[PDB]
Amino acid sequence: YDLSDDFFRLFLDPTQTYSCAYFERDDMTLQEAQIAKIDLALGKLNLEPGMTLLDIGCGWGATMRRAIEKYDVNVVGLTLSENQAGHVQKMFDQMDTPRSRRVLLEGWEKFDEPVDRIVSIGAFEHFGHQRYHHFFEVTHRTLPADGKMLLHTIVRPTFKEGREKGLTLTHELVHFTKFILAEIFPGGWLPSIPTVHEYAEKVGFRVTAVQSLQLHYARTLDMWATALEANKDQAIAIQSQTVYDRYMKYLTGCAKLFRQGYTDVDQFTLEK
């Protein structure tokens, strides 16, 4: 099965956002910084009341809930997670708004409905390079003439290794990376910036904006680690020491990587 949600609730903030947060103010709590990230991403889609927003890889729904409440738009979210689909539908059934709200347990490969805007945060890393062209073709064909998509994903730093770029690449990296791709992003892939640009532009997309959040991810990871650690006993009771150590190793290790510049997190604004 998939890792139990009661496990995730041991380190994620209340909204259950599972992606790099945005510390607009350094004093923000994790929940405040995750709400800040949602507003940052959505603010770029120039949302207007009555529009329809597609959330590709919606997780537990915080982004779509925010879109409805703060921006007053209709939403639709796709996820591959059984637990999330059910959780988001229950969420949807509990709230009251004349806004349409739909959640679907299916990949972006099967979605083919016209929407006004698209947002995808932390999903792209799970797609795998071989499907990139398809993803951009599908998202580009569902968007309108004035459509835009906000693609938020982990990326590999560009060639700056010269006169900079901790040119170290061996063990205390290579091995960990295999660990990350095997345990954290099974069948996934971390793209280079040139690659994102490559496939996006090849379907007609114009990359009109890019924003890096490198150091915000390091602090997000630190906070998830601190929370998991404080809830160690409960984490081990619900799952196991193996899973616990697995995640602590992931969180603490990646925090170091983004902090040292080995990896980055970018938000790409793409216009049809």
Ligand SMILES: Nc1ncnc2c1ncn2[C@@H]1O[C@H](CSCC[C@H](N)C(=O)O)[C@@H](O)[C@H]1O
């Ligand atoms: N091919 C695919 N199609 C649709 N959703 C996918 C997908 N591959 C991964 N996902 C989804 O993308 C999400 C990654 S975790 C991020 C969740 C949410 N965007 C947040 O910011 O918290 C999960 O919901 C996962 O099920």
